[PDB]
Design a protein around this ligand. Structure first.
Ligand SMILES: *C(=O)Cc1ccccc1
Ligand SMILES: *C(=O)Cc1ccccc1
Lengths: 124, 360, 360, 122
């Protein structure tokens, strides 16, 4: 349970690039930017689109689908920059790719930070 | 889980401070960083384009920024603006058009201020000819251009009057402007000479009391402007320095380099030894704590290379800032006590401000 | 003395390189830094707003940039553009309007290219649906989307044809587009599957010859697309790795991570040991030099933590780039020789390019 | 004197904040930015206005009037940042003041770099 609920967990843990659900983040962790893992910092707008990663949970041993939605429309947060690439693939598998700005379709495409939204267990 | 927006800042207003990051290495992406001074947590930010300036509304509800845009940044039409932002949602609400002469420069408090009653923003222009611009916040309009202030610089609000402020002029005196309820000049007055521009230049940063302001000089003297009446009465110098201090050439240095704790009359000043021509912006070796009633120093503490400060009266706090890091001090007693340092609060900031809690 | 403008770059074109600084920390103020590779001297720069991309015209006269503006940066109307800059004066000449879907992303070469004849700029779009955009440089016009490239990514020009290029598609094959004189698609073809997207994904960066391109995979295999004939012939894998290499889990890693020296057939690749899922963008422990004819490694040298490279066929040089520093190598012999390092060429660059010399 | 002609001097000397004529420079030296002491980097525009002051030349013992013109209309050069303050004064002596953007009246006011133009003997 606690492994799946970052708001209860240690902030130093969730604000680390090694936190299990941040396994394909290329950008600033929103939880270090005045937001949380699932809420944009005030005045930044969620992206409707994202890259997706599957990350291994070290507690329950299961793999989970993570949607790396960005928060957009504010200039770069600059804090907790990560560049993790587990299962990341190039732009010919576009929704697995994290070298593009997933704010690209927002009303304002300026990239602020990246979130790590837990969708559920990897599909089976 | 679902990512949501629309959230407010997670800490109460009374915890918030505003670190104006010029980002001089990339000055087109200046911003305000919002921190919780109680724990160092980053709370959010407001983008401010090229060389932004910032203040918080006196009622605490809004953040005001001043900036310059161009259609294509480095080319195209210029737009100088004030923006109104919600303080809790950190969202843009309104743009107020300015003439294309708002001051572009480092973040001294006195370049972007407001009347005590909060109804008017009062800002410095330079084209390079100087004037003071008045923005009516409720109307969202630039309503007055105080050409009487030509050759003067910076805005010192009078906290004992609703719509009055002073500016430092080229004669070494002060021009006082009293605005009407429409934001137009209702009256003005000029003080006698307070300081010699050539022989004892003052730093522009006031140590501001409710009814008077103190200024420190390049050579460590103190001048005052008492505005308890309609006519400002000026005095000084008295020296910050005793004979021992003079032997080591102690002088003030910094940017927003002074502060006043109103309840006690203590004035805080950044100082460094081996003063000489060209050292007026040097980082603090020490912070000196002066009793403005007795005109004597009461304490001195390490300066942590600070350049700018600000004071919160009601919680008895002083923040200092070395360009990148913010130090939080308890000044409830004459010797400041360091509570914490917020590392990496900015890349290139010369200004920090508390969220106002005192109301209007 | 009098300060004057209007000056040209001080070093001749053949000395120049272009370091595309994303300035990711302040991505709205990205820029191109121009350096003299022969002595490390900074020559000038071109501002490129939010996440700029850059290339030099094949004829060496102009610098092309691609960027995004908004009326108020973080709000207001979006303008995606190509800009044409004079190479010698580093001045803006022309803006070419794009639809608001130009690719925003890290600076892989293949996102912003041109036809061999120089007549068309060929760029990647993502809305997030992908298409290729064609810009007629003569006309200063956007032609239309190459919708046939949906589900594909990046642009690999065919150097043996005037206005043809390929893209890598989600089926693991290549789509070839042949433009007419108006920049519209005149014909196209699709190769057979070259690589398994699931089992042996390739890096998009080509090691490009005049009539063929090689690609390396996440697991250190090599694939090729030969476009000497009417239609593309694909092959691979062959392995970069011997038994010893495999035992230490050597694999490629980087961004613009490969290069081809066309006259010798030597392929340059950044490599690191202890490869596993997630290490495909790791800095180079080494640079390996492969003979593409014999399919054997001919040299290995320290990687200097490089991530991206580029090759100059006319001077037999390789540049490498670790994000901030540019290394200059002589590659006229199988073992590269390090000539110098240019420190602090960028804050956050993943792409360096030579100013073109010759190349007809 | 050689001390008056930076184009004839060692570049490392001229590109230093302690070079004698850079005595009230707040910003990036244009000579490190692809320009020279008296020429803007390509594609940046001189400011028609500037802060001014005098600097002492320890090589010939004389004092010189300096005009600290900027080059404008390109984003920050970032190289050779100086913050020297000899005889610099606040904004109530405006033309002696260096905490303002002397590109403020240019067609594009984006600050690129600053320099130190020798006007003559003080
Ligand atoms: C993820 O969206 C962060 C990012 C932004 C811009 C370019 C590359 C990656
Ligand atoms: C001098 O013009 C450099 C500068 C630019 C912007 C603000 C302050 C100083």
């Amino acid at each position: 349970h606690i492994s799946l609920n970052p708001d209860l967990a240690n902030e130093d843990e969730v604000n680390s690039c090694d936190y299990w659900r941040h396994c394909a983040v290329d950008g600033f962790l929103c939880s270090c930017c005045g937001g949380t893992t699932t809420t944009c910092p005030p005045g930044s707008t969620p992206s409707p689109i994202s890259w997706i990663g599957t990350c291994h949970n070290p507690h329950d041993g299961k793999d989970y689908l993570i949607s790396y939605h960005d928060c957009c429309g504010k200039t770069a947060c600059g804090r907790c920059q990560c560049n993790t690439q587990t299962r990341e693939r190039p732009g010919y598998e576009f929704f697995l790719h994290n070298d593009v700005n997933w704010c690209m379709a927002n009303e304002n495409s300026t990239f602020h930070c990246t979130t790590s939204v837990l969708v559920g267990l990897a599909k089976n | 889980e679902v990512l949501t927006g629309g959230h407010s800042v997670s800490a109460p207003q009374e915890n918030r401070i505003y670190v104006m990051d010029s980002v001089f290495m990339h000055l087109t992406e200046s911003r305000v960083h919002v921190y919780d001074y109680t724990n160092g947590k980053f709370l959010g930010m407001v983008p401010t384009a090229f060389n932004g300036h910032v203040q918080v509304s006196n009622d605490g509800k809004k953040i005001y920024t001043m900036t310059t845009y161009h259609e294509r940044i480095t080319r195209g039409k210029r737009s100088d603006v004030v923006e109104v932002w919600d303080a809790d949602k950190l969202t843009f609400e309104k743009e107020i058009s300015l003439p294309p002469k708002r001051v572009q420069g480092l973040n001294y408090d006195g370049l972007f201020r407001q009347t005590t009653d909060g109804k008017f923003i009062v800002l410095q222009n330079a084209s390079p000819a100087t004037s003071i611009g008045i923005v009516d916040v409720a109307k969202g309009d630039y309503v007055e251009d105080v050409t009487a202030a030509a050759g003067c610089w910076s805005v010192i609000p009078q906290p004992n009057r609703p719509r009055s402020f002073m500016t430092i002029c080229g004669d070494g005196g002060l021009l006082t402007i009293n605005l009407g309820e429409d934001g137009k000049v209702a009256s003005q007055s000029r003080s006698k000479q307070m300081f010699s521009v050539k022989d004892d230049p003052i730093f522009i940063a006031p140590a501001l009391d409710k009814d008077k302001a103190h200024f420190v000089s390049y050579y460590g003297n103190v001048y005052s402007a008492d505005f308890s009446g309609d006519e400002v009465k000026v005095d000084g110098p008295w020296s910050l320095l005793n004979d021992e201090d003079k032997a080591k050439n102690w002088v003030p240095g910094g940017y927003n380099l002074v502060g006043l704790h109103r309840a006690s009359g203590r004035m805080y000043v950044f100082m460094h030894p081996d003063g000489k021509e060209g050292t007026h912006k040097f980082p603090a070796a020490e912070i000196w704590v002066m009793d403005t009633k007795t005109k004597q120093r009461v304490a001195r503490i390490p300066g942590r290379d600070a350049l700018s400060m600000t004071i919160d009266q009601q919680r008895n706090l002083m923040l200092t800032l070395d360009g990148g890091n913010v130090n939080v001090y308890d000044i409830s007693q004459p010797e400041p006590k360091l509570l914490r340092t917020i590392e990496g609060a900015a890349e290139a900031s010369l200004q920090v401000q508390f969220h106002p809690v005192g109301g209007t």
